[PDB]
Design a protein around this nucleic acid. Structure first.
Ligand SMILES: [Mg+2]
Ligand SMILES: [Mg+2]
Ligand SMILES: [Mg+2]
Ligand SMILES: [Mg+2]
Ligand SMILES: [Mg+2]
Ligand SMILES: [Mg+2]
Ligand SMILES: [Mg+2]
Ligand SMILES: [Mg+2]
Ligand SMILES: [Mg+2]
Ligand SMILES: [Mg+2]
Ligand SMILES: [Mg+2]
Ligand SMILES: [Mg+2]
Ligand SMILES: [Mg+2]
Ligand SMILES: [Mg+2]
Ligand SMILES: [Mg+2]
Ligand SMILES: [Mg+2]
Ligand SMILES: [Mg+2]
Ligand SMILES: [Mg+2]
Ligand SMILES: [Mg+2]
Ligand SMILES: [Mg+2]
Ligand SMILES: [Mg+2]
Ligand SMILES: [Mg+2]
Ligand SMILES: [Mg+2]
Ligand SMILES: [Mg+2]
Ligand SMILES: [Mg+2]
Ligand SMILES: [Mg+2]
Ligand SMILES: [Mg+2]
Ligand SMILES: [Mg+2]
Ligand SMILES: [Mg+2]
Ligand SMILES: [Mg+2]
Ligand SMILES: [Mg+2]
Ligand SMILES: [Mg+2]
Ligand SMILES: [Mg+2]
Ligand SMILES: [Mg+2]
Ligand SMILES: [Mg+2]
Ligand SMILES: [Mg+2]
Ligand SMILES: [Mg+2]
Ligand SMILES: [Mg+2]
Ligand SMILES: [Mg+2]
Ligand SMILES: [Mg+2]
Ligand SMILES: [Mg+2]
Ligand SMILES: [Mg+2]
Ligand SMILES: [Mg+2]
Ligand SMILES: [Mg+2]
Ligand SMILES: [Mg+2]
Ligand SMILES: [Mg+2]
Ligand SMILES: [Mg+2]
Ligand SMILES: [Mg+2]
Ligand SMILES: [Mg+2]
Ligand SMILES: [Mg+2]
Ligand SMILES: [Mg+2]
Ligand SMILES: [Mg+2]
Ligand SMILES: [Mg+2]
Ligand SMILES: [Mg+2]
Lengths: 46, 271, 93
RNA sequence: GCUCGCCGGAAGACCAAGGGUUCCUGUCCAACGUUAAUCGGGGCAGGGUGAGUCGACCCCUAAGGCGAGGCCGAAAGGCGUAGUCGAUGGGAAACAGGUUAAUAUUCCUGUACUUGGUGUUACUGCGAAGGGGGGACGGAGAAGGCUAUGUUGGCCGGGCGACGGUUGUCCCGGUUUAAGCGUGUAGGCUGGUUUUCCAGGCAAAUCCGGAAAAUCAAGGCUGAGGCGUGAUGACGAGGCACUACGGUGCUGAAGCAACAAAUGCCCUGCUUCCAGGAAAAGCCUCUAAGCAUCAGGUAACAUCAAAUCGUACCCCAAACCGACACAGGUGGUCAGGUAGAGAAUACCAAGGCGCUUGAGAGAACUCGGGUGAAGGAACUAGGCAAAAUGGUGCCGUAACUUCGGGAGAAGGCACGCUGAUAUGUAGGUGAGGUCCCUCGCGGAUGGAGCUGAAAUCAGUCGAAGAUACCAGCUGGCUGCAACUGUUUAUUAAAAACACAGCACUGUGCAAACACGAAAGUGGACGUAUACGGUGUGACGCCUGCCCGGUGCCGGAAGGUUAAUU
RNA sequence: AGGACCGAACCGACUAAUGUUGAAAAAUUAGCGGAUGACUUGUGGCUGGGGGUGAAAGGCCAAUCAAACCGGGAGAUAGCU
């Protein structure tokens, strides 16, 4: 049976990547929150 | 010419088609074409603002001359062509200076006919004139609403407008819908009726034929739940309500026109 | 033209391996570890000037570092560039 | 290593996605592997991915995204113009052989091709952000011509058989060869050429479009395959000699022909239909500003350049998605033999596997199968399940019907093998030779060779010849829904939803309506033979009475009636 | 010609058995329906939570739906256990 996760690197980067997060101010607030928490990996980008 | 199909399959039994041997069989005139991508009824918010639109056959847009503003240069009809974008047929005409144009095909026109636009054009089907120079009682189509804007009234297959009176700067038209309306006498009109009057005689025959034309199915309000339609709900077939749109407005007789800007041009309503 | 500083920085080490040995003895090709950003032309010029040979053509590839294990710790070695550079069948450096 | 069994439109091979070293070599067996492990996709260490031509990057655009100014919005922001991004699509170029433990169209050998920049030359109107052509496009169907590929013969090498026979009409095996270049064919499309003129192509134009003369009556474009060459080359069964028995060095015969034949190619063609079938650039062509014995363009020759990144390995899977080394899911390509209509099915080839617990025993009972006396639905809610039918050709086939159907209705007959008709037939293919013409991949004639159904008659074996796999049960009455479709992913597939058709109603275009504080957008680049809403639901015969109640539509004499005053 | 017929790939899911601490949080086996179309499939894109989408089952919107998920108001309130 087809499961929910069907990986596509291009779609991953466009949906959740660094440049997508930096596009809007809410994405930038996501980045600011994750910086404040001290996340080692800011986004899915790499 | 209308042709009844033979019942060789259940989907063909009721099909009645309109067959015209004079329509061009080849490819359209390329320099007068352009793309037109489908919308599926979605606006720029991506939301369905008009239901039941989607799919269908790919189509190319044909740039049709609705303005008929190339005055005093006779043109010759080269062929009649099918137009997927409208019910009427279109005619490719060639002007004497070498320019080619699409016009709406009026009734009775065929290859070799000469048309002409202008104040001095003869009173013949397919000739465009300002309505100040068209005799009272004449039958016209492709009627302008504002001078120089382009034809906007009586464009579908088999439609036409009657010029009932001419008094002052305005003429009175009997619209196909049956209302009397005023319009400026400088607005242009084309003599005769739109051709292809047998278009309304077609019978699609099957659901897939309507799907070919980009129409998606209509679900009845009474067949759904109350959460998504005022007609919804019930144990078995129940209605007990005054019929309304999916947004609750009465949908049997309640008038919806509200335009006091243009109320002055409406001599009499269709009734 | 490439300066002496760049040409002096672009050659890292000679790669030594059994495939390198057979390339030496069979195709007059030497195998080198070179700078990661080094171009084919830079490698050619550096070999020609700092070794004094005639160079026919340079072939390059990038080697990926392996993910290792130093006692439950997840390490990763560095990428590096390797150059297959052949000589004009008359040099044998 | 010898046997045995399994897959073989895959359980073989290769691309894309996704993963990331799982690839190869050496070493180790704690933990991991559902058992043991000397083995491993496990640990540890080293090695391994070579490009002008493959891909990305690059040029170009689709849907869509973002968007200088702009319009709108308490703020945040929203939409959108010029623009700029965005492939799943358009755009230049390489093949064959050999080689590693692990890469190869990338390395080597041989033989090619594309684009650009410079320098010399012969000439020469060059020049875009503009004009025109082109690129450039659907479904179905049909035949012809081919090729991949296969069969058989010829040829070459080898063999003469564990048990009766095996010098033959015997057996085994091989019989291969690219891109490029030259030829322009089966075939498809279009009438050329030269003048003159012209409200068109935002201006101009020699280009396109239009018009009129003359002239020839053929010119051009496109095109699979074949042939020649590439190639006296490479490859080649096999055969000589070592060996670390993993492999190696060397030499090397034949290398032809006929037939059959694709879902691949000609073919982005042809024919036909209605639902009428991207864009932009590369490319060709035309001029504007402008420049002018210069810059620039064309041909020739030479020289230089073609960067950067990917390339291992899995990829219907133990490496991807499913917590697992999980009977699941995962897009595209290749496509041998015999039988067969076939990519069904059975047995096989190449190639790959025996599924990471085994050894005994031969109770009940459970699971999956085989057979069954006499009866034959008596079982049961119900023939659930099982059993049964099952192919080709021919004969024949009812009610009803919207005249198409019903229909494969029902039912029945033949079916293997051998010989003859006919040392192999009807047919298909087609050589030599003979003749001819604008001599060529030509025509005509001609029929050798090859391949080859089906039928009839006679005979013959078995219980049985559509013998295996494979492969409709049939008929009668009736409810519902016209029909093909759609639905409760994961207890409901239906009589529910949809449907073509019908009706009512709104809507005159800055349409009604819908998403939006708005700007706008969809409706629609549509215009009442159109569009939205509602109900009904093919078709046939039809659809009666009630406006008291509620809703909607029209009216305004009168009564009552807000803010305001 | 055909939302034509029989039938593989492919798409689906009518019946039965098994399995029900499964090989599998929906499968397997034998049968079953469609199979040129209102078909099916790859890549990319758009619609966002009182909102979307829905040939309409209150279906689906990441194993979650008569109002998704995450965080916050928040130690909501709980005459109840
Ligand atoms: Mg993660
Ligand atoms: Mg509608
Ligand atoms: Mg309807
Ligand atoms: Mg319901
Ligand atoms: Mg309600
Ligand atoms: Mg009831
Ligand atoms: Mg009631
Ligand atoms: Mg490289
Ligand atoms: Mg490892
Ligand atoms: Mg291994
Ligand atoms: Mg163990
Ligand atoms: Mg290992
Ligand atoms: Mg090279
Ligand atoms: Mg924007
Ligand atoms: Mg701005
Ligand atoms: Mg771009
Ligand atoms: Mg854009
Ligand atoms: Mg692409
Ligand atoms: Mg390999
Ligand atoms: Mg052949
Ligand atoms: Mg086919
Ligand atoms: Mg590889
Ligand atoms: Mg698996
Ligand atoms: Mg296993
Ligand atoms: Mg699939
Ligand atoms: Mg099979
Ligand atoms: Mg037993
Ligand atoms: Mg049993
Ligand atoms: Mg039995
Ligand atoms: Mg027995
Ligand atoms: Mg019995
Ligand atoms: Mg018996
Ligand atoms: Mg009986
Ligand atoms: Mg009984
Ligand atoms: Mg009983
Ligand atoms: Mg049964
Ligand atoms: Mg059975
Ligand atoms: Mg009954
Ligand atoms: Mg039905
Ligand atoms: Mg059905
Ligand atoms: Mg269900
Ligand atoms: Mg079910
Ligand atoms: Mg509008
Ligand atoms: Mg109904
Ligand atoms: Mg069908
Ligand atoms: Mg079928
Ligand atoms: Mg389904
Ligand atoms: Mg099954
Ligand atoms: Mg069927
Ligand atoms: Mg319900
Ligand atoms: Mg769910
Ligand atoms: Mg709520
Ligand atoms: Mg509080
Ligand atoms: Mg609490």
């Amino acid at each position: 049976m087809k499961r929910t996760f069907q990986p596509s690197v291009l779609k991953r980067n466009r949906s959740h990547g660094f440049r997508a997060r930096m596009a809007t101010k809410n994405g930038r607030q996501v980045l600011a929150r994750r910086r404040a928490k001290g996340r080692a990996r800011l986004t899915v980008s790499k | 010419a209308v042709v009844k199909c033979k019942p060789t399959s259940p989907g063909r039994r009721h099909v009645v088609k309109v067959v015209n041997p004079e329509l061009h069989k080849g490819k359209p005139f390329a320099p007068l074409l352009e793309k037109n991508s489908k919308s599926g009824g979605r606006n720029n918010n991506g939301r369905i603002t008009t239901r039941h639109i989607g799919g269908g056959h790919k189509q190319a847009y044909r740039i049709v001359d609705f303005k008929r503003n190339k005055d005093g240069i006779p043109a010759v009809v080269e062929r009649l062509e099918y137009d997927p974008n409208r019910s009427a047929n279109i005619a490719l005409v060639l002007y004497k200076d070498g320019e080619r144009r699409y016009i709406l095909a009026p009734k009775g026109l065929k290859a070799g006919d000469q048309i002409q636009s202008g104040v001095d054009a003869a009173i013949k089907p397919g000739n465009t004139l300002p309505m100040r120079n068209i005799p009272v009682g004449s039958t016209v189509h492709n009627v302008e609403m504002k001078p120089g804007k382009g034809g906007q009234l009586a464009r579908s297959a088999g439609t036409y407008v009657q010029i009932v009176a001419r008094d002052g700067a305005y003429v009175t038209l009997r619209l196909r819908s049956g209302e009397m309306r005023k319009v400026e006498a400088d607005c242009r009109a084309t003599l005769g009726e739109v051709g292809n009057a047998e278009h309304m005689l077609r019978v699609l025959g099957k659901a897939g034929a309507a799907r070919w034309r980009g129409v998606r199915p209509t679900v009845r309000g009474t067949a759904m739940n109350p959460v998504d339609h005022p007609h919804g709900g019930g144990e078995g077939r129940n209605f007990g309500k005054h019929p309304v749109t999916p947004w609750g407005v009465q949908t049997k007789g309640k008038k919806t026109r509200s335009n006091k800007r243009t109320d002055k041009f409406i001599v009499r309503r269709r009734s | 033209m490439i300066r002496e500083e760049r040409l002096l920085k672009v050659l890292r080490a000679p790669h030594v391996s059994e495939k390198a040995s057979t390339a030496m003895e069979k195709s007059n090709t030497i195998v080198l570890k070179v700078a990661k950003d080094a171009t084919k032309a830079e490698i050619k010029a550096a070999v020609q000037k700092l070794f004094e040979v005639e160079v026919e053509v340079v072939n390059t590839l990038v080697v990926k570092g392996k993910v290792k294990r130093h006692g439950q710790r997840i390490g990763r070695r560095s990428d590096w560039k390797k150059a297959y550079v052949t000589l004009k069948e008359g040099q044998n450096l």
